[PDB]
Design a protein around this nucleic acid. Structure first.
Length: 493
DNA sequence: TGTCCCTTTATCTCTCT
DNA sequence: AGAGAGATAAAGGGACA
């Protein structure tokens, strides 16, 4: 018989019992733990169910799932109940920071290394606890922390990097590898190829940073004699997760795409310059004729769709959904292109296909409004949040649909909508902002932190902002969000 | 296998003027 | 506002005990 059967049965028995108190996990949460943490993680969650949820630790089930759903999840669960109080009491970290550190493969190793190295990293090396947490919060966080401890001096002194740059390089999966490669390759890239340290740090500061750096060293000459690419274009392609893959694929496909479809090298670089650029490029070579055929999409529209992260997904989804969205949902092909041309275009297109009839019929929105909400990065999230929160925002908080749509229609729309729902009453009732002022602040990218910064200044007034009236703070918050507020704070000192 | 570490892709959010 | 920059999660494979 199949040898996985006993383990599967074990998995399903324990999984069954976890649906009950005190965690009450659903099918999704149970699969996710089983998929990454495996059977031992599911058993560990069960064995630890009472110790984790209530006093002292008081972790939400969602936090428990976050910790359990990684390789070594059983180890991370044991370590969190042991070290969370130690790290909160003795180093001043928050439970949320400890959970963040724990929620990666080898989370045990990261937690124990933070307990061990935070004092020396902050005292002897000048890092903040926030920076130590960022470094720790990735797979291999232990390796990254130990490599920062070892290399921070030689990187700053012998190689001229700031501590901030070292931290930025370290704060990715494989960070140890990127730091070691930057040490070796910084003078080579800078002195042989005229790259600035800032450009090298940018290439290094992604997952797989080591691979992108070595690939830049290898291919920069070939790409900048043969293909007429500039160093700046090469840097841009490499300054992204999977940079190595994008760069190699640009070498392969630049002449194919230019010659066979009349794309410019500019257009090719733009397609390549996202996570998954490799995937996007290969999909363009495949699908452009299919999309542009029989007077379909234009080349220019295909380039726009492809020129975002997940371009491959967006392209394939357009091919699938253009007819059904145009025929059945009444959208123009131009509106499908708009929705598709943002990171996560696939998700937004599918969510529009699913929610356009509902938002229109149940909530009284126009298709144009649904399209505008969808046509930003994270469009799926904004659309679902509008569906969820339109009745409460309108009926309980007195906003018009138009105001809700405005808040929703920027990157981070979901966050802005949730924060408005959260903070509208204290901003208006407790501190005298008008709803229109709250809507204005929230109706920009970064609407959520801009609102939180405002609430913070009204709730725990910093003297440095006291010379500003509420109306002035509102104007600043609309002008430049949290950063403007923070900038003003510093200017005062 | 279970655990740790590294890489790639996809998605989401905020910043920068 | 659209280009730039940065966070996070899923998922696969090397490595090794």
């Amino acid at each position: 018989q199949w040898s996985g059967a006993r383990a599967l049965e074990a998995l399903l028995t324990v999984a069954g019992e976890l649906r009950g108190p005190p965690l009450q996990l659903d099918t999704g949460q149970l699969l996710k733990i089983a998929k990454r943490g495996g059977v031992t993680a599911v058993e560990a969650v069960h064995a630890w169910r009472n110790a984790l949820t209530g006093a002292p630790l008081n972790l939400t089930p969602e936090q428990v799932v976050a910790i359990a759903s990684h390789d070594g999840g059983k180890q991370a669960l044991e370590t969190v109940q042991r070290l969370l109080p130690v790290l909160c009491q003795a180093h001043g970290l928050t439970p949320q920071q400890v959970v963040a550190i724990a929620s990666h493969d080898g989370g045990k190793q990261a937690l124990e290394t933070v307990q061990r190295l935070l004092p020396v990293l902050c005292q002897a090396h000048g890092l903040t606890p926030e920076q130590v947490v960022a470094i720790a919060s990735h797979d291999g966080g232990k390796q990254a922390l130990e490599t920062v401890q070892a290399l921070l001096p030689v990187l700053c002194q012998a190689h001229g990097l700031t501590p901030e740059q070292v931290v930025a390089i370290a704060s990715n999966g494989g960070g140890k590898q990127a730091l070691e490669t930057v040490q070796r390759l910084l003078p080579v890239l800078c002195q042989a190829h005229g790259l600035t340290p800032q450009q090298v740090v940018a290439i290094a500061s992604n997952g797989g940073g080591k691979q992108a750096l070595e690939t830049v060293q290898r291919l920069l000459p070939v790409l900048c004699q043969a293909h007429g690419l500039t160093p700046q274009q090469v840097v841009a392609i490499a300054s992204n997760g999977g940079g190595k893959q994008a760069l190699e694929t640009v070498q392969r496909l630049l002449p194919v795409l230019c010659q066979a479809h009349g794309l410019t090298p500019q257009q090719v670089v733009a397609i390549a310059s996202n996570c998954g650029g490799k995937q996007a490029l290969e999909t363009v070579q495949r699908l452009l004729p299919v999309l542009c055929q029989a007077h379909g999409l234009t080349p220019q529209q295909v380039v726009a769709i492809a020129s975002n992260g997940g371009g491959k997904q967006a392209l394939e989804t357009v091919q699938r959904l253009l007819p059904v969205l145009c025929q059945a949902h009444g959208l123009t092909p131009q509106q499908v292109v708009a929705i598709a041309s943002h990171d996560g275009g696939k998700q937004a297109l599918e969510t529009v296909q699913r929610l356009l009839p509902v938002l229109c019929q149940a909530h009284g929105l126009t298709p144009e409004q649904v399209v505008a909400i969808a046509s930003n990065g994270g469009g799926k999230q904004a659309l679902e949040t509008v569906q969820r929160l339109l009745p409460v925002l309108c009926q309980a908080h007195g906003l018009t649909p138009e105001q809700v749509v405005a808040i929703a229609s920027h990157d981070g729309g979901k966050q802005a909508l949730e924060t408005v729902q959260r903070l509208l009453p204290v901003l208006c009732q407790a501190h005298g902002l008008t709803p229109q002022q709250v809507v204005a602040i929230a109706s920009n990218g970064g609407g959520r932190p801009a609102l939180e910064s405002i609430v913070a200044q009204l709730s725990r007034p910093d003297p440095a902002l006291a010379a500003l009236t509420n109306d002035h703070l509102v104007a600043l918050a609309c002008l430049g969000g949290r950063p403007a507020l923070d900038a003003v704070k510093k200017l005062e000192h």
